[PDB]
Amino acid sequence: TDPVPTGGDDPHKVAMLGLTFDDVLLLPAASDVVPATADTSSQLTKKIRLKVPLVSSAMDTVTESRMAIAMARAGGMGVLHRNLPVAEQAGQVEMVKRSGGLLVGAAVGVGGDAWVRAMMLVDAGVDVLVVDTAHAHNRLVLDMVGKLKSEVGDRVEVVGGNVATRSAAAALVDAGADAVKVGVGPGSICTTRVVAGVGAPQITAILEAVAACRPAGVPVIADGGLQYSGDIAKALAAGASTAMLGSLLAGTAEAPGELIFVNGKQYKSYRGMGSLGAMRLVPEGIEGRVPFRGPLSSVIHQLTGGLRAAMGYTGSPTIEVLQQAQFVRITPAGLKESHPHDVAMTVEAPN
Amino acid sequence: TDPVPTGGDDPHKVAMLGLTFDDVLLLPAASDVVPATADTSSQLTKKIRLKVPLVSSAMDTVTESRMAIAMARAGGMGVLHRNLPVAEQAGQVEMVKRSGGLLVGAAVGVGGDAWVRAMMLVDAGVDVLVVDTAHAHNRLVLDMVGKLKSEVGDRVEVVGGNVATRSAAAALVDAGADAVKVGVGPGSICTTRVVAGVGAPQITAILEAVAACRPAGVPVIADGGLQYSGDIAKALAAGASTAMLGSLLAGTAEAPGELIFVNGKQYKSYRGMGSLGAMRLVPEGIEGRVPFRGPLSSVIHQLTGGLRAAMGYTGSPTIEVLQQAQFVRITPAGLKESHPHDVAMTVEAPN
Amino acid sequence: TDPVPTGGDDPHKVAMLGLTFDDVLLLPAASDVVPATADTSSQLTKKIRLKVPLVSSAMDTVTESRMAIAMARAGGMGVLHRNLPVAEQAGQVEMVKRSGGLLVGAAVGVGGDAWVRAMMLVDAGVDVLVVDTAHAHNRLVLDMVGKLKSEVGDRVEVVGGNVATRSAAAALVDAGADAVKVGVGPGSICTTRVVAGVGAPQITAILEAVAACRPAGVPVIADGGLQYSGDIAKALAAGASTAMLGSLLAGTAEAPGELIFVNGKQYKSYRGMGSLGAMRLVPEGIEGRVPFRGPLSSVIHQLTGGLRAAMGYTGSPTIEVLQQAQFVRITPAGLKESHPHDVAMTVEAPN
Amino acid sequence: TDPVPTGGDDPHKVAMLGLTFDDVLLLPAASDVVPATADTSSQLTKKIRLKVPLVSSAMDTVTESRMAIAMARAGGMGVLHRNLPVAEQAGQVEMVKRSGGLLVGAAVGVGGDAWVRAMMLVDAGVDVLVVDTAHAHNRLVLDMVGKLKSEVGDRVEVVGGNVATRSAAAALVDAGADAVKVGVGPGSICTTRVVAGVGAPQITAILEAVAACRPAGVPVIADGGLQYSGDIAKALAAGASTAMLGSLLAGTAEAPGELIFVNGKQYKSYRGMGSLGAMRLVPEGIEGRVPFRGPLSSVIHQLTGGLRAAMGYTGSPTIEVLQQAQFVRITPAGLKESHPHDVAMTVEAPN
Ligand SMILES: C[C@@H](Oc1cccc(-c2ccn[nH]2)c1)c1cncc(-c2nc(Cl)c[nH]2)c1
Ligand SMILES: C[C@@H](Oc1cccc(-c2ccn[nH]2)c1)c1cncc(-c2nc(Cl)c[nH]2)c1
Ligand SMILES: C[C@@H](Oc1cccc(-c2ccn[nH]2)c1)c1cncc(-c2nc(Cl)c[nH]2)c1
Ligand SMILES: C[C@@H](Oc1cccc(-c2ccn[nH]2)c1)c1cncc(-c2nc(Cl)c[nH]2)c1
Ligand SMILES: O=c1[nH]cnc2c1ncn2[C@@H]1O[C@H](COP(=O)(O)O)[C@@H](O)[C@H]1O
Ligand SMILES: O=c1[nH]cnc2c1ncn2[C@@H]1O[C@H](COP(=O)(O)O)[C@@H](O)[C@H]1O
Ligand SMILES: O=c1[nH]cnc2c1ncn2[C@@H]1O[C@H](COP(=O)(O)O)[C@@H](O)[C@H]1O
Ligand SMILES: O=c1[nH]cnc2c1ncn2[C@@H]1O[C@H](COP(=O)(O)O)[C@@H](O)[C@H]1O
C-alpha cells in the first residue's frame, strides 16, 4: 500500500486544510439590496439580539467602562476585562448601568475565586457572563458553564470559550452555553502559534464550530484575527453571528490608556492578556502599540459601512441571509494585489 | 460522512478556485505567424470592430476629450467619464466628433437623471453607451440596459457592467446587452476586496463570463487588473474580445490633470471613482499617483507589440484564434522570478 | 494516456509532497492536562531516558564540556563535537564525568581513525556514541554502526545518522542502531539544498523515518530546522522522541567562543561543520553569528515551557501521547500572520 | 455538468501545472558513490561527449574566443554569439582552433544570410552549429535544421532551439536535430513572461521535452534559469544531458567586457540578446549587471563540485544514473528557509 503523499501511512495524521480570512473572497450574487437598506441586526446569545453585530475584546487595553458605554450606544456591546479586583470590576458594571440601562458583559475565569467574582457581577446587574479561557475543551471549564447556567441562568446569559474544533463546540453546547466563542491562534498579539505550535486558521475553525452549533440554535462569536471591515463580512458568511474585536478598537479614544506622541505620529498601548506585563507559564502574547484612530463612534461607522457594502454585493437583506453566501478561494498571487497594488497612495483613506 | 477538507459539511460553500493573471502563462504552440504579420482587430460590441483591442477607463483621471481622440486615432476607443454635468459630457462628445468622425463612448448610471444624460449623449452623436455600475447583477441595472436598447438601440450600441460570474453575465445577455464588461475586485485602485471582502480573481471571472456570452455571440470586455502588456494577451486567450485600461494609461500626456515633478521624477494623479475625493457609502477606492509615461501613441505601440509577440508564440493569426490558446499554471516560486530575477538592471526598458 | 499534470509520463518521478514545520499547526483536543502537570520525559535511545527531550548539536560552536555539563544538569544531554584531537575529545568526556557522573555523548566519523577515536571515548566513560555523517545511507556507515554494537554494545549505546527517508531509516534499524537521527537539508546554517540541490522537508522526513523505526521500537532524533519552542512540539507530534538543537543554543553563555559586542548589541559565532572555516569537497555550510541569549538554564526553561503548553492544548499527559496528536495544514496566507502580525512590538519577549 | 473548479467547462484550457527549479529537491538514496569518485561526463550531441556537462550561452556579454577556449580547457564547451559580422565570427572560430584543436560551437539564425554564415563557420572548422531562435516550433526553423544536416551533417553536428513542449521537441527530432535546446521564459534577463505573457516553468519543460527526445536517443540541453550549482543537478535529474549558463558565467574574467568598479564593489555588464541595446519588435530582454566572480576555471570548479555532491547523495556513479533520480515537491514555506535562513552571515562563501 502506497504512503500518504505528505508522509507516513495514516491519512488522518494531517486531518484538515485550514483557511484564514486572506484565503477567501465573497462572490457577488443576484441582489435587490443596496447598502442603505441592509439590516445588520444579529443574535449575540440565544436571548440577546444586537443592532450592530460587534463586541469589544475583554482586554485591559481595550474595554473598561468608557468603551462599554460607547459600544452599547453604537448598537453593539462591550465585555469588561477581569485583570483587576472583583470590587472594581463590579463597580464598572454599575457605572455602565447608570448611563441608561445599556447592555454590558463581563469576563470570569474558572474556580472558586471566579465563582465569587461571577456572583458579585450578577448582583451589580450584568447581562452576560463570559467564561474566558485559553482552552475551553476541558471538564473544569464545562462544569463552570453548566453551574452558572443552573444557578443564575434565569437572570443572565452565559458564554463559553475559546474553541477551534467541532468536537469542542459540541461539548460547550451540551453543557448549556448560550453562545460559543471561537479562536485559538488567530489574534494579532497572539504567540500561541509559535510558542506552543498550536492553532487553527479562523475560516475553517468557524465552519467547523458552526457545524455543531447551528443545528442546536446556539450562536457563534468569531474572536480574533479580524484586520479589515471585509473580514467581518467573511466571518459572518462562514456562519458566525457576531465578531469580537481587539486590535481594531484598541486605537480609539475610549480604550484604556493614554495617547503616545512619538515621531509626530500617535499611538496607544495594546498587549495580550498572556503577555509578561499583563500577567504581572511562559508568555503566549506580546506587548506593543497601534496607531491612534480617533473616536469609537467613527470607527464603528466605517466598519458597519463595509459590512453593508458586502450585503449589497451578495444580495443579503439580513445577517441570516449573509450566513448562506458563497466563497471563492484565492492563491498567493491574488492576495498580494488585494492590498492597494502598485499605485503610490497619496491621500488618507478612512477605511 | 467525512467533513469537507477545508471545513463544514457543504462541498459548495467554497465554490471555486480563482486564478488571477499572475497564476498563468501562455504555452508556445506550432506557428507560421510572426509578430509583424499578426492581425490585432477584434469586436468591441456586436456591431463595432476595432483595429486595436483596447479601450480607456471611464474615470476622471483617465478619459476626457483629448484621450478619446488619441485612442480612436490609435485604433482603439475611449469611454468618457460621468463625474461632471450632463451638458459638459455631451459637449466632450461633440469635440471628439469634430476631429474626424472618430468612434467614442460615454458612461451613464441608473435612474431618471441617468436617462436624461443618456438621451443628450445620443443627440450629440455618441456611438456606445456604457451602463456603468459597481454591481450589475440587479434588476434596476438590467431594466436600464433593456430600456436603452428598446428606445435607441437602432442608433447606438449598449454595454452593461460590471459582473464577475456566469449567472450575472447570462442575465445581461438576456436583457439585450451588446457587450458585457467583467471585473469586481481586480483594479489597481480598488479596495472593494478589503472594505467589503468581495471579489473574483480575473482569469476565472473571464472564463466564467465567456461560458455564458460566447454561445450567444456577445463580446466580453476584460476590465481591471492589467499591469503589463502580457496581461492583455492572457485576458484575450481566456476568451475576452477587448481589454479596458486605467492605470496603464493614467500616466500619459493625454490623461486629465497636470504633471507632478517631485524628487526629480514626474507623476500624475490617479484615483478610484469610489474614492473619497471623487465622490466629493464608505469609500471603495484610493487616491494616489502613477509615474509619467509620455505620449499615448507610444504607450499603445508598446502594448500592441507585446500582444503581437504572444500571437507569434501561440500560432494565432487573428484574435479569434488567440481565444483558443492554452495556459500552464504556475506556483509562487515561479512568479517571483518572472519580474527580472537577480540581475541588477541598469538601463531603461520601454516595456 | 494523459501525461502526469506536472510533466512526463512517470507518476513517481515527483514522489512526495514535503511539509516543513511552518506548513502545520497542532489542533487543540479534549484535555485534563495543564502545563504544570505534564510529564516531559522521553527515550533518547533504547536504554536511555531523559527528563527533558532535548540534546545539543555536535558542533564546534555549540558543544564542548561546559555545554554538556549544563545540558545534563537541565535534564537533557550534550553530544561533544569531533573537530579536535582524539586525546582532547576524550579529556572533555572525563571533565563531564568529574562533575557528578552526568550523562554525555560524543561524535565519531567512519574508518580506521574514527575507530581509534571511538575506543578512547569508551575507555573515558562515554554513555552514547554518535556515528555522525552527512549521508548515512551507505554500506560503510552501516558497517561502522554494526561493528561498534558488536564490540562495545554492552557498555555504550550507538546512534547513527543522518537520514531523510523510510528506506534509509530501515537500513540503520537492521544494522543495530539504538536510535536514528533525521535531517538532510533543514539546518539553519545548511547550504546542501542550494549547493547540491538535495534535501527533504523535515515534517515529512520524520513521518517517513518513524514509519520504519516505531514498529521496531527504535527512537527517532529530529535534528535541524527548529526555530521556536513550538517546533519542538511539532517534531515530537510527528513521531520523534527527542530533538537536537544548534542555532537555538549557540547563543548561550555555555557555547564555545567569546561574546561579540557590535553596534551596542551582542552576538556569538555559529558555523556549519561543512563550512570553509570548520574544514580548515566544496562547502555545504556557512559561517555566521547569532544574537546573545544568556545562560543555558534560562533558554531551556523557556523551550520546555512552550512544550508544556502544547501538551495542555492537545490533552497529552506524556510524550508518548503527544506522538498521537493531529495536525492542520496551513497556506502561505496563514504563516505570514503567525509571526506577530501587525502590532508594533515595543517590549522584549522571553520566548 | 459541473464547471471546471478554476473556471469554464473545458478541462484542458489550463493544461498543466508547471514546476520550476525552486519547486523541487532531490531525495537522498542508497549510495556507494562519494563526490570524488563520480563521473561527470555526458553527451552534448549524438556524436559529441563532454568531460563536464556545461556550455556557455551564445550572448555578446558571455562568449567570444577567450571564453570558448577556457570552457573547452575546463572540459565543457562555448557557443560563440552571432551579433557581429560573419567574417569576425568565423575568425573567432579560427582563434579557438589555433589554441589546441579544442571543441567549439557557433550560433546562426534562419534565412539566406544565416546560410552564408553557416557555410563560412564550417569552412573555419566549427564542430557544432546551433540554430538559435526565440521560437523553434515553426516550419522555417525546422527547414533550416534539416537543410544543414543534409548538406554538412557528415562534418558538423546540428542543434536546434529553443522549445518548451513535447510536441515542439518531437518536431525537431523528426527534422534531424542532433540535440534539442529547452527554455522559453526562464532566463535571468528574460522579459518574455511579462511582455508577451508566454513561458513554461523549466522542470516541467525538461520533463516534457525528454519524453519526446529520450526514446529517440537525442540529448536535451537545459538552457536558462540556473542560479546555483544545485540547479544543474536538478536539470540533469529531470532528464537533460547538459546545461547552458548565462548569468553564472557573465561575471568571470573571460566574459567580454570591462570590469566595473562602483561603490568599492565590482561588476560586469550582462544583457539579453532581445534587449534594446543588443538589437541596436518590442524588446523581450533587459540590460543590467552582475557581480564580478574571478577566473572561469574557479567558477567551473565550484559548480562541478556541487554536482558531484548531488551524485554522492543520490547514489549516481554516472550522469546516466542521475537522470533516474527522484524529486520531493516543496511548498512556499520550504523555499524561504533554503536561502540561509536566520543566521547573520559574516564570512564569504565560494559557492
Ligand atoms: C463607493 C463606490 O465604490 C465604487 C466601486 C466601484 C465602482 C464605482 C463607480 C462609481 C462610478 N462609476 N463606478 C464605485 C460605490 C458607489 N455606489 C455603489 C456602491 C456599491 N453598491 C453595492 Cl451593491 C455595493 N457597493 C459602491
Ligand atoms: C525581441 C527578441 O527577443 C528575443 C527573445 C529571446 C531570444 C532572442 C534572441 C535573439 C538572438 N538570439 N536569441 C530574442 C525577438 C527577436 N526575434 C523574434 C522574436 C519573437 N518571435 C516570436 Cl514568434 C515572438 N517573439 C523576439
Ligand atoms: C500564558 C497565558 O496565555 C494566554 C493565551 C490566551 C488567552 C489568555 C487569557 C488570559 C486571561 N484571559 N485570556 C492567556 C495562559 C494562561 N493560562 C493558561 C494558558 C494555557 N493553558 C493551556 Cl492548556 C495552555 N496554555 C495560557
Ligand atoms: C562539505 C561537508 O558538508 C557537510 C554537510 C553536513 C554535515 C557535515 C559534517 C561534517 C562533520 N560532521 N558533519 C558536513 C561534507 C563532508 N563530507 C562529506 C560530504 C558529502 N558526502 C556526500 Cl555523499 C555528499 N556530501 C559533505
Ligand atoms: O496573550 C494572548 N494570547 C493569545 N490570544 C490572546 C491573548 N490575549 C488576548 N487574546 C485573544 O486575541 C483576541 C484579540 O485579537 P485581535 O482582534 O486580532 O487583536 C482576544 O479577543 C482574545 O481572544
Ligand atoms: O473606486 C473604485 N473601486 C473599485 N474599482 C474601481 C474604482 N474606480 C474604478 N474602478 C475600476 O477599476 C478599473 C481600472 O483598473 P486598473 O486598470 O487596474 O487601474 C476601472 O475601469 C473600473 O472598472
Ligand atoms: O555545514 C553543515 N551543513 C549542513 N548541515 C549541517 C552542517 N553542520 C551541521 N549541520 C546540521 O545542522 C544541525 C543544526 O541545525 P539548526 O539547529 O537548524 O541550526 C546539526 O545538528 C547538523 O545536523
Ligand atoms: O533577450 C532575451 N530574452 C529572453 N531570453 C533570452 C534573451 N537573451 C538570451 N536569452 C536566453 O537566456 C539564457 C540565459 O539565461 P540565464 O543563464 O538564466 O541568464 C540564454 O542562453 C538564452 O536562452
Short mmCIF file of C-alpha atoms in Angstrom, two decimals, chain B residues 121-292:
data_model
loop_
_atom_site.label_atom_id
_atom_site.label_comp_id
_atom_site.label_asym_id
_atom_site.label_seq_id
_atom_site.Cartn_x
_atom_site.Cartn_y
_atom_site.Cartn_z
CA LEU B 121 -25.35 61.89 -25.34
CA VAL B 122 -27.25 60.17 -28.17
CA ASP B 123 -28.32 63.54 -29.59
CA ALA B 124 -24.65 64.60 -29.55
CA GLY B 125 -23.63 61.61 -31.71
CA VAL B 126 -22.19 59.05 -29.27
CA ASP B 127 -21.55 55.56 -30.72
CA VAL B 128 -21.62 53.46 -27.50
CA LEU B 129 -23.42 53.93 -24.16
CA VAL B 130 -21.86 52.14 -21.16
CA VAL B 131 -24.21 51.42 -18.23
CA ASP B 132 -21.51 51.84 -15.56
CA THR B 133 -22.12 50.28 -12.09
CA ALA B 134 -20.26 48.60 -9.22
CA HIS B 135 -22.70 45.62 -9.19
CA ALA B 136 -24.68 44.92 -12.40
CA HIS B 137 -26.49 41.75 -11.09
CA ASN B 138 -29.54 43.80 -10.07
CA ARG B 139 -32.97 44.22 -11.68
CA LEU B 140 -32.73 48.02 -11.87
CA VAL B 141 -29.48 47.76 -13.88
CA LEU B 142 -30.91 45.10 -16.21
CA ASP B 143 -34.00 47.29 -16.77
CA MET B 144 -31.79 50.26 -17.72
CA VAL B 145 -29.92 48.18 -20.33
CA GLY B 146 -33.15 46.82 -21.82
CA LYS B 147 -34.93 50.18 -21.94
CA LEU B 148 -31.99 51.86 -23.69
CA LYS B 149 -31.85 49.06 -26.28
CA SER B 150 -35.60 49.38 -26.91
CA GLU B 151 -35.59 53.18 -27.35
CA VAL B 152 -32.29 53.98 -29.10
CA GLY B 153 -30.85 50.53 -29.84
CA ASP B 154 -31.13 51.10 -33.59
CA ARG B 155 -28.74 54.07 -33.40
CA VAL B 156 -26.31 53.21 -30.56
CA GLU B 157 -24.71 50.11 -29.03
CA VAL B 158 -25.35 49.41 -25.32
CA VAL B 159 -22.77 47.87 -22.88
CA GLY B 160 -23.52 46.75 -19.32
CA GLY B 161 -21.27 46.00 -16.33
CA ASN B 162 -19.59 45.15 -14.14
CA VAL B 163 -20.05 41.39 -13.42
CA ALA B 164 -17.82 38.54 -12.21
CA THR B 165 -19.93 35.33 -12.55
CA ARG B 166 -21.55 33.18 -15.24
CA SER B 167 -25.08 33.84 -13.89
CA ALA B 168 -24.61 37.64 -13.88
CA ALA B 169 -23.26 37.63 -17.45
CA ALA B 170 -26.21 35.48 -18.58
CA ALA B 171 -28.67 37.98 -17.06
CA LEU B 172 -27.11 40.87 -19.04
CA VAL B 173 -27.25 38.76 -22.24
CA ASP B 174 -30.98 38.14 -21.70
CA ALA B 175 -31.58 41.87 -21.14
CA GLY B 176 -30.16 42.68 -24.63
CA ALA B 177 -26.60 43.85 -23.93
CA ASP B 178 -24.35 44.34 -26.98
CA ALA B 179 -21.26 43.57 -24.81
CA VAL B 180 -20.65 42.51 -21.16
CA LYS B 181 -17.92 44.11 -19.01
CA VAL B 182 -16.15 41.90 -16.41
CA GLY B 183 -14.35 42.95 -13.22
CA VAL B 184 -15.33 43.08 -9.50
CA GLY B 185 -12.28 43.36 -7.22
CA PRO B 186 -9.23 43.46 -9.56
CA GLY B 187 -8.46 47.14 -10.22
CA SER B 188 -5.18 48.72 -9.13
CA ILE B 189 -7.00 51.44 -7.13
CA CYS B 190 -9.79 49.13 -5.86
CA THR B 191 -10.38 48.49 -2.15
CA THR B 192 -13.66 46.55 -2.51
CA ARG B 193 -11.66 43.40 -1.67
CA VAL B 194 -10.64 44.67 1.78
CA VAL B 195 -13.54 47.03 2.61
CA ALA B 196 -16.35 44.60 1.66
CA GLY B 197 -14.36 41.33 1.45
CA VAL B 198 -15.89 40.79 -2.05
CA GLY B 199 -14.28 39.94 -5.39
CA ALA B 200 -13.30 37.40 -8.04
CA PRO B 201 -9.81 36.67 -9.48
CA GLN B 202 -9.94 37.94 -13.07
CA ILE B 203 -8.83 34.90 -15.18
CA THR B 204 -11.56 32.74 -13.57
CA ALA B 205 -14.09 35.62 -13.83
CA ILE B 206 -13.39 35.92 -17.60
CA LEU B 207 -13.60 32.13 -18.16
CA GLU B 208 -16.99 32.02 -16.39
CA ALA B 209 -18.47 35.09 -18.13
CA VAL B 210 -17.33 33.78 -21.54
CA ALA B 211 -19.08 30.46 -20.86
CA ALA B 212 -22.37 32.45 -20.92
CA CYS B 213 -21.55 35.11 -23.53
CA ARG B 214 -19.69 33.18 -26.28
CA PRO B 215 -22.61 30.78 -27.05
CA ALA B 216 -24.83 33.87 -27.52
CA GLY B 217 -22.34 35.79 -29.71
CA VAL B 218 -21.89 38.63 -27.18
CA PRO B 219 -18.33 40.03 -26.76
CA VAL B 220 -16.70 40.30 -23.30
CA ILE B 221 -14.62 43.35 -22.17
CA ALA B 222 -11.94 42.46 -19.55
CA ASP B 223 -11.86 45.49 -17.17
CA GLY B 224 -9.23 45.97 -14.41
CA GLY B 225 -6.03 44.42 -13.03
CA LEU B 226 -3.93 44.60 -16.22
CA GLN B 227 -0.36 45.60 -15.26
CA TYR B 228 1.82 44.56 -18.25
CA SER B 229 1.34 44.10 -21.99
CA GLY B 230 1.42 40.31 -21.41
CA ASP B 231 -1.73 40.59 -19.26
CA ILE B 232 -3.63 41.77 -22.38
CA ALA B 233 -2.68 38.54 -24.19
CA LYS B 234 -3.75 36.42 -21.18
CA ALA B 235 -7.16 38.19 -20.94
CA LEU B 236 -7.94 37.63 -24.64
CA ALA B 237 -6.75 33.99 -24.51
CA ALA B 238 -9.19 33.41 -21.62
CA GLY B 239 -11.92 34.43 -24.09
CA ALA B 240 -12.34 38.23 -23.79
CA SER B 241 -12.55 40.27 -27.05
CA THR B 242 -11.17 43.61 -25.73
CA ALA B 243 -9.44 44.95 -22.58
CA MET B 244 -10.14 48.19 -20.62
CA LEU B 245 -7.15 50.00 -19.05
CA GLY B 246 -6.92 52.55 -16.23
CA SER B 247 -3.51 52.57 -14.51
CA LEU B 248 -1.56 51.79 -17.70
CA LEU B 249 -2.97 54.92 -19.44
CA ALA B 250 -3.31 57.33 -16.48
CA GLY B 251 0.35 58.27 -16.78
CA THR B 252 0.13 59.62 -20.33
CA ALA B 253 0.20 63.19 -21.61
CA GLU B 254 -3.42 62.96 -22.79
CA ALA B 255 -4.87 61.91 -19.42
CA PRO B 256 -6.65 64.71 -17.50
CA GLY B 257 -4.56 66.50 -14.90
CA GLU B 258 -1.21 68.29 -14.61
CA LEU B 259 2.27 66.84 -14.35
CA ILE B 260 3.77 66.38 -10.86
CA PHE B 261 7.52 67.00 -10.55
CA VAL B 262 8.63 65.60 -7.18
CA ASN B 263 12.13 64.46 -6.19
CA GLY B 264 13.31 64.95 -9.77
CA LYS B 265 10.81 62.35 -11.00
CA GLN B 266 7.40 63.03 -12.53
CA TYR B 267 3.91 61.70 -11.74
CA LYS B 268 0.22 62.27 -12.44
CA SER B 269 -2.84 61.82 -10.22
CA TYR B 270 -4.88 58.59 -10.43
CA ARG B 271 -7.91 57.83 -8.21
CA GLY B 272 -10.82 55.42 -7.98
CA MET B 273 -14.31 56.70 -8.79
CA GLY B 274 -15.39 55.34 -5.38
CA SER B 275 -12.65 57.24 -3.54
CA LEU B 276 -13.49 59.99 -1.06
CA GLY B 277 -12.23 62.70 -3.41
CA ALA B 278 -14.13 61.51 -6.49
CA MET B 279 -17.41 61.17 -4.59
CA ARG B 280 -16.90 64.75 -3.37
CA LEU B 281 -21.40 54.92 1.29
CA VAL B 282 -17.92 54.29 2.68
CA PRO B 283 -15.17 54.57 0.03
CA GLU B 284 -14.17 51.53 -2.06
CA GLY B 285 -11.20 53.17 -3.83
CA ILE B 286 -7.97 55.06 -3.08
CA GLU B 287 -6.42 58.33 -4.30
CA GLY B 288 -2.82 58.13 -5.49
CA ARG B 289 -0.32 58.75 -8.29
CA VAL B 290 1.48 56.92 -11.11
CA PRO B 291 4.74 57.62 -12.96
CA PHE B 292 4.63 59.87 -16.01
#
